[PDB]
Each structure stands twice: as structure tokens, then as C-alpha cells.
Amino acid sequence: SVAHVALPVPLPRTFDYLLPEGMAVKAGCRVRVPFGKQERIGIVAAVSERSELPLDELKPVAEALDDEPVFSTTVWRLLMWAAEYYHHPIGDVLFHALPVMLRQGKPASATPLWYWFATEQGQVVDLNGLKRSRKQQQALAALRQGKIWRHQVGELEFNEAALQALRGKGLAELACEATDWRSAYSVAGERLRLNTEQATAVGAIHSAADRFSAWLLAGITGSGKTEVYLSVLENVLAQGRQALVMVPEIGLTPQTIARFRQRFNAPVEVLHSGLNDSERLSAWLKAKNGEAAIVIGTRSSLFTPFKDLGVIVIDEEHDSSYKQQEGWRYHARDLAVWRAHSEQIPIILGSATPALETLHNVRQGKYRQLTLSKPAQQHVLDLKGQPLQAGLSPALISRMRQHLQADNQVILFLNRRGFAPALLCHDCGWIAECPRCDSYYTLHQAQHHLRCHHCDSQRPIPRQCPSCGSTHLVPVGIGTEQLEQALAPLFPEVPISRIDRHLAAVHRGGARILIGTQMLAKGHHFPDVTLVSLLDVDGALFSADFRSAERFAQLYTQVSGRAGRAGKQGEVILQTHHPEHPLLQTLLYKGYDAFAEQALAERQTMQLPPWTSHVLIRAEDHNNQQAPLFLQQLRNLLQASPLADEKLWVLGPVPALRWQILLQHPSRVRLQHIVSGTLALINTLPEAWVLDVDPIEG
Ligand SMILES: Nc1ncnc2c1ncn2[C@@H]1O[C@H](COP(=O)(O)OP(=O)(O)O)[C@@H](O)[C@H]1O
Numbered sequence: 001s002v003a004h005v006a007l008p009v010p011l012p013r014t015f016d017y018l019l020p021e022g023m024a025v026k027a028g029c030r031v032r033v034p035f036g037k038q039e040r041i042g043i044v045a046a047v048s049e050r051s052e053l054p055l056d057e058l059k060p061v062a063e064a065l066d067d068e069p070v071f072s073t074t075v076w077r078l079l080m081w082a083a084e085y086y087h088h089p090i091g092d093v094l095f096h097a098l099p100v101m102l103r104q105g106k107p108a109s110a111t112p113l114w115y116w117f118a119t120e121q122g123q124v125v126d127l128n129g130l131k132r133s134r135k136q137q138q139a140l141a142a143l144r145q146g147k148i149w150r151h152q153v154g155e156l157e158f159n160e161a162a163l164q165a166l167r168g169k170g171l172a173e174l175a176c177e178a179t180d181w182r183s184a185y186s187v188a189g190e191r192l193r194l195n196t197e198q199a200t201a202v203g204a205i206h207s208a209a210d211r212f213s214a215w216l217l218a219g220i221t222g223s224g225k226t227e228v229y230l231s232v233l234e235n236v237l238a239q240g241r242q243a244l245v246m247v248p249e250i251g252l253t254p255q256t257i258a259r260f261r262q263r264f265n266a267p268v269e270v271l272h273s274g275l276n277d278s279e280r281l282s283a284w285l286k287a288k289n290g291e292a293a294i295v296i297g298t299r300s301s302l303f304t305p306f307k308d309l310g311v312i313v314i315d316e317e318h319d320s321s322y323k324q325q326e327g328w329r330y331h332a333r334d335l336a337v338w339r340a341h342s343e344q345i346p347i348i349l350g351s352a353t354p355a356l357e358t359l360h361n362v363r364q365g366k367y368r369q370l371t372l373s374k375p376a377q378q379h380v381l382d383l384k385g386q387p388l389q390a391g392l393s394p395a396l397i398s399r400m401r402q403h404l405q406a407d408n409q410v411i412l413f414l415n416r417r418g419f420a421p422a423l424l425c426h427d428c429g430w431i432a433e434c435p436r437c438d439s440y441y442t443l444h445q446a447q448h449h450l451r452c453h454h455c456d457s458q459r460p461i462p463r464q465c466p467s468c469g470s471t472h473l474v475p476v477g478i479g480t481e482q483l484e485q486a487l488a489p490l491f492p493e494v495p496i497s498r499i500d501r502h503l504a505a506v507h508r509g510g511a512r513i514l515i516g517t518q519m520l521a522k523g524h525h526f527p528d529v530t531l532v533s534l535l536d537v538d539g540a541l542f543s544a545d546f547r548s549a550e551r552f553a554q555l556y557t558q559v560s561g562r563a564g565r566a567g568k569q570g571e572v573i574l575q576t577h578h579p580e581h582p583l584l585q586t587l588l589y590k591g592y593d594a595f596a597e598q599a600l601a602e603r604q605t606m607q608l609p610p611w612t613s614h615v616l617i618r619a620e621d622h623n624n625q626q627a628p629l630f631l632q633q634l635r636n637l638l639q640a641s642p643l644a645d646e647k648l649w650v651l652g653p654v655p656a657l658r659w660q661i662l663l664q665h666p667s668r669v670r671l672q673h674i675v676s677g678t679l680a681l682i683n684t685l686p687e688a689w690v691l692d693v694d695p696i697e698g
Pocket residue numbers: 193219220221222223224225226227523
């Protein structure tokens with residue numbers, strides 16, 4: 001009688017409509033409803049016999065677009081929970097989970113694809129006639145060889161006009177075409193690749209395959225993590241169940257795709273960024289109907305429906321790209337784990353450098369670890385008192401030339417762009433710390449001051465180091481200053497190129513300097529690189545962002561096993577003003593896992609994630625000012641709201657690395673409800689504003 005309908009609007013509620021008699025429609029189905037004078041597509045959240053709004057103002061539902069729900073029960077429950085946890089409007093959440101074509105109210109069914117083909121006559125006709133009809137002979141000559149899809153005519157030189165003219169002469173016609181892989185699926189033969197550790201990992205996952213279990217597959221690069229994924233998948237597909245494989249945004253390489261395609265005598269569906277809406281819907285349907293054995297995709301592939309999902313694999317579990325930074329700011333990994341729990345299936349998280357969140361979860365009961373085991377010389381250069389050219393010390397340049405004149409490649413790594421730096425003395429290594437809290441000052445040269453972020457303290461930029469008297473105070477964490485402009489005159493006629501995602505000149509080998517700011521794609525290798533230098537180690541060690549050391553440790557550990565693998569002797573050089581920094585020392589001589597153990601214990605002392613939960617609230621006001629006051633009002637509304645516990649820790653209005661406030665709490669659930677209540681009632685009108693649960697900051 002009454003349908004509670006969700007719309008793709010920035011409002012956290014459902015609009016009511018009347019259900020005319022005869023119109024069958026459950027929750028999870030799409031509807032066409034009136035909205036003002038115009039018309040809108042919506043989703044039925046709930047169907048009640050009851051009454052909610054003024055009954056007379058209730059307009060009826062214009063059309064029921066789906067007979068059956070477009071989300072499954074567990075996926076539906078997942079999205080309901082995600083909306084509650086991320087505090088994002090239920091309508092936007094639900095519509096974001098659907099393909100574009102289904103958002104627009106089109107049928108949830110596979111569109112037929114049509115082709116032109118040469119008729120019986122067109123195959124034999126004297127090619128002496130069309131020799132005066134312009135494009136039609138070219139159109140038919142192509143048709144002689146094979147069919148031509150309609151969505152490909154635009155890539156050719158003859159058009160639909162040339163083809164429809166052949167149609168009228170009876171020489172071309174239009175037709176379209178109509179699938180069970182489980183029968184005739186060969187589990188492959190005993191072929192016996194797996195080693196001891198690999199087989200144990202496969203066995204352990206197999207022995208618990210009929211329930212939920214979150215596994216961390218922790219192994220260094222080359223240990224054969226992918227090989228375990230492939231074997232696990234074989235078992236799952238042997239049960240006639242489907243699989244989802246998630247990779248980072250840059251992970252869908254032709255080599256990776258070919259690897260999966262060749263291993264499985266079963267359909268593999270790849271959700272890459274080049275697909276159009278039809279192709280995406282087609283893939284969505286193939287998965288929903290159980291026709292796709294394996295789906296490979298990136299962050300959004302999490303929302304794909306499955307007739308019978310049997311396993312989830314997330315490769316490069318630590319990658320940032322699993323966190324959506326625009327609109328609905330969900331984390332694909334967490335939601336995937338949630339999805340695995342509700343469906344009661346295994347999820348396998350794979351990384352050579354697992355997130356601290358993940359290692360914490362393993363240390364506690366949450367995840368189970370399966371480990372895989374099975375040279376590169378490293379130098380630490382002291383920048384203190386060194387005359388730099390392009391941020392490069394004499395010692396590094398000396399090593400660089402010895403690699404370049406040997407006709408080899410060199411990679412330099414930097415700290416992206418836009419990040420706000422710390423300030424230190426180039427001569428004695430003094431760092432600007434806040435006097436109140438032991439926290440590094442963030443340098444704001446555009447604002448002419450140093451600002452604390454753990455507390456809120458103002459201090460002007462010193463002209464000289466107060467410790468040693470030197471004027472050579474430098475900003476650390478700046479690499480956007482077009483390094484090539486200084487590298488070209490330092491390295492004459494040597495080609496300079498950027499890695500960050502035509503550039504097949506890298507595969508040519510020879511003397512070359514490569515510049516990167518982010519971690520490299522899986523399988524994507526640089527065999528001609530024999531020297532890797534990590535510039536601005538200080539930017540990572542003295543950042544206001546508490547996760548910078550983690551990201552650096554990951555970057556360092558990745559690139560530590562890519563300096564010309566097996567073939568040539570690789571060299572890793574790090575430049576820093578503090579060579580004997582304890583954290584850095586642990587990383588360099590003990591490895592990532594030991595860094596992680598120490599970093600994790602320091603997170604506990606400082607009461608930081610993953611030991612606590614975080615929620616950010618950002619604001620962007622043109623007014624540069626007043627906006628902090630809006631957050632000041634929101635701070636006070638957050639104070640006395642039921643649930644104080646003298647555990648809730650709120651950072652007052654502090655500018656970002658744009659303004660923000662920070663909420664911290666030992667309990668994830670409690671912090672959710674504190675935000676739930678404070679957002680339920682909002683007092684002053686918002687003109688300035690986003691909400692970020694579990695922020696990765698970067
Ligand atoms: N046991 C193996 N079988 C096949 N290929 C392997 C094996 N070990 C390593 N490789 C190759 O080395 C690269 C990285 O190893 P991979 O098996 O993907 O493990 P990981 O996922 O830990 O990097 C891949 O490109 C892969 O082709």
C-alpha cells in the first residue's frame with residue numbers, strides 16, 4: 001500500500017509514495033516516481049501497510065521497473081549498514097552501487113547486439129557494379145570476410161548510410177545472437193606447482209571454505225601469492241561457485257589478465273576503466289546470473305552481484321586506491337570483509353607490506369595469517385651540511401653517474417605534491433617541534449607561520465636555526481619543484497621521464513633517470529634499473545600525518561625488490577638528515593614486519609588508529625575565515641551529546657594539510673552513534689563540508 005522510496009539525493013531519508021492495487025513490488029526494486037513536476041528513478045527501501053506522512057499528499061508510483069530485487073539480501077544488508085557507518089545518504093549509497101544504465105531506469109536485462117552480414121547474394125555478386133557506388137563496395141568487401149558490429153561502424157570509413165543502402169539492394173542484412181561452463185569445467189590435472197608453504201596456505205583456506213574466515217596472505221614479492229589465489233580459485237570453481245578478485249586501480253595489466261584467462265577454462269569478467277555502460281551492465285548481469293566464474297576489478301567491483309560467491313581475494317591489500325576519496329568515502333577492504341562475513345565465505349587479503357590495521361587484526365582474533373617466504377645493497381647518506389644540487393648530495397650524484405655511464409637506469413622517489421612540509425636545519429638537523437605537545441610544526445610559508453596540528457599553536461617562521469645559528473633552514477617533503485629543470489643541466493643529454501600513471505622508451509634501456517612519487521603496479525617491472533634513490537626520507541619521518549612512516553616503509557620495501565631482479569646487482573640509497581632515526585633503523589636492518597611491530601606499539605602509546613577509531617569533518621569556505629567557527633559550533637554540539645565517557649577526544653578547528661575537526665574514540669561502535677546523534681540534529685544553516693569515517697588522510 002505504501003512504498004518508502006530512496007532517491008539519489010543528498011538527504012538522509014526516504015520519500016513516501018502510494019502503491020496502486022495490482023502493482024507488485026518488494027524492497028530492493030527500482031521504481032519510477034513523480035518528484036515535483038518532473039520524474040525520477042528511485043529504489044524501494046521498504047513496503048508497509050502503515051501510514052507515515054500526510055496521506056493526501058502521497059502521489060502514486062508511476063512504474064515498477066523490477067519484478068525481483070536488484071540487490072541480493074546480503075548485499076542489501078551490506079549497503080544499509082555502510083550508509084549507517086559512513087553516515088552517507090541511503091539513496092546515494094544505493095544508487096552508487098548500481099551500474100549507470102540501472103540508475104537511469106533501464107531494464108535489468110542484456111541488450112541485444114546487432115551485426116551487419118553479407119546475404120547469400122552479397123557473397124557471390126559481380127564486384128563490377130558497386131564500382132560506381134562510392135562506399136558500398138568497400139562496405140561489402142569487408143562484409144565478405146566476416147560480420148560487422150554496429151557499435152564498430154564508427155571506427156570504419158563507410159557508414160550506416162552505406163550499409164543500409166546495401167540492405168535495400170538485398171546485399172546486406174541485420175541479425176543478432178543469443179553458456180554453461182560448470183559442465184566441461186576441468187579442475188585441471190595434478191600439475192604440482194605449489195611448494196610446502198604455498199600448499200599449506202591453500203589447504204588451510206580449503207579446510208575452512210564452507211564458512212567465513214578472513215585470511216592475511218603475507219609474503220614478500222616473488223613468494224607466489226598470486227599462485228595461491230589461483231589454486232584457491234580452482235577449488236572454489238570446482239564447487240561451481242564464483243570468485244571476486246580485487247586489484248589496485250593500476251593493477252589490471254594485460255599480463256595479469258592473460259595470466260587469469262589462460263589458467264581457467266571458465267569465463268573471466270574484467271571490470272577495467274575503459275568499459276562503456278553497456279559493457280558494465282553486461283558484466284553485472286553475467287555475474288548476477290552465475291555465467292561469470294571469476295570477476296576481476298578494482299575498488300567498485302565490490303558491489304557486483306553473484307549467484308553464488310565462494311571467495312573474495314583482495315590483492316595489494318594495503319593500497320590507498322581501495323579508499324574512495326570523493327562523495328561516499330567507503331573503504332573497499334572493510335566492506336569486503338563485511339560482505340565475506342554476511343555471505344559466510346573466505347576473504348584473502350594479500351600484501352608484502354600489510355597495513356597496520358591488518359597486522360593489528362591478525363594480532364587480535366580478527367584475521368588469521370598465512371605466511372610465505374622465499375641481494376640488494378643499501379646505503380644511508382647523511383644530508384647534514386652537504387651542498388645539494390636538485391636535492392641530491394655529492395655522494396648520490398657520484399653513484400648516479402657511475403650507473404648512467406654504465407648505460408643503466410636510475411629511479412628517484414619523491415613525496416607527491418601538495419603535502420605541507422616540516423621545517424629543519426640543514427646543518428645540525430634541528431626540527432621545529434611544538435613546545436606544548438611533542439609534535440612537529442607544519443610549515444605554512446604561504447601563510448608566513450609554523451602551525452601545530454596535534455594542538456593549536458601559532459609561531460612565526462624563524463630566520464635562523466635557534467640551535468646552531470645557521471640560516472639554512474629547509475622545508476622537507478617538497479618534490480613538485482620540477483626536478484627535471486635542475487636535473488637536465490646536472491645530467492647532460494640524459495633523458496628524463498615520469499613513472500606516475502607512449503613511454504616505451506623505458507623498455508629501450510640505456511642511461512635514463514626515472515621519477516616516481518607513488519608505489520609501482522604489481523608485476524610492472526623495471527629490469528634496466530640498477531639504482532633506486534628515495535629522496536626526502538625526512539618528509540616521511542617528520543610529517544604531521546602520523547601514517548607517513550607506514551607509507552614510506554611500504555614504498556621502501558616494495559622498491560627494495562625491484563632494482564633489476566635476479567639479473568643485475570641493485571643499489572638502494574636513502575638520503576636523510578637523521579641517519580640514526582630509530583624507526584628508520586629498524587626498517588632498514590630488520591625489515592617491514594619489525595618496523596610494523598614498533599610502529600604499532602607507538603600507535604598504542606599515542607592512542608592512534610588502529611588502536612582507536614577516527615572520523616574527520618572537513619569544511620571548504622571561500623571566506624578563509626568564519627568556516628573555522630562553523631566547526632567550533634559543531635564541536636560544542638558534539639560535546640554534551642549523550643556519550644561523553646571522557647574518552648571522546650575532539651580536535652578543535654585546525655586547518656588541513658580548508659579546515660577540519662578530528663573525532664577519536666577507543667570504541668568504533670560508540671563513535672558511530674555519537675556521530676549519528678550529532679548529525680541527526682544540525683542547528684545553524686550550512687553554507688560552507690564533508691564527513692570522513694576511517695580517514696587515510698592522504
Ligand atoms: N611459483 C610461480 N609460478 C609462476 N610464476 C611465478 C611463481 N613465482 C613467481 N612468479 C612470477 O613472479 C612474479 C611475482 O610472483 P607472484 O607469483 O605474482 O607472487 P606475488 O603475488 O607474491 O608477487 C609474477 O609476475 C609471476 O609471473
